[PDB]
């Protein structure tokens, strides 16, 4: 059958978290999926270029953070770095 992966269930969970009583259309679902894919490619690309610029062969959380600081503008970037730091800290603690 060749299963094709997607970010559907995840953006659905997020939707239920922020708006428990709202729905989502299939078109908008695909749009959100393409959105997350695009940003993923952007941040990962910029992180890759960052690693290559400093003669490093490993993309750590630092490269990701700098990439987010370069891509996302202003307060969006601030909250992004905030959530990222919280997540990586909570992951570091809870083994």
């Amino acid at each position: 059958r060749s299963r094709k992966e997607s970010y559907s269930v995840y953006v659905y969970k997020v939707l239920k978290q922020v708006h428990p009583d709202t729905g989502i259309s299939s078109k908008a679902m695909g749009i959100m999926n393409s959105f997350v894919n695009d940003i993923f490619e952007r941040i990962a690309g910029e992180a890759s270029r960052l690693a290559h610029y400093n003669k490093r062969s490993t993309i750590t959380s630092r490269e990701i953070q700098t990439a987010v600081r370069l891509l996302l503008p202003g307060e969006l970037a601030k909250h992004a770095v905030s959530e990222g730091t919280k997540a990586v800290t909570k992951y570091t603690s809870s083994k």
Partner: protein, 65 residues
């Protein structure tokens, strides 16, 4: 030998870490003890890269790895 240092278990009086005045409440965004609204203003408009240095001076910075 060299393991005779002992920690504590007691309520600590938490002071401010911008100034030295006694401060009763912290923040969600930056987790800084602060005295009043002037120090809150200077906390919420400080340039980036220093809001982590205050926790570095107090300890438990937890820099990334």
């Amino acid at each position: 030998t060299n393991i005779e240092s002992a920690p504590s278990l007691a309520p600590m009086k938490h002071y401010c870490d911008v100034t030295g005045l006694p401060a009763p409440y912290l923040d969600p965004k930056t987790r800084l003890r602060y005295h009043n609204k002037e120090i809150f203003a200077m906390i919420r408009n400080l340039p980036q890269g220093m809001g982590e240095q205050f926790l570095e001076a107090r300890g438990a910075h937890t820099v990334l790895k």
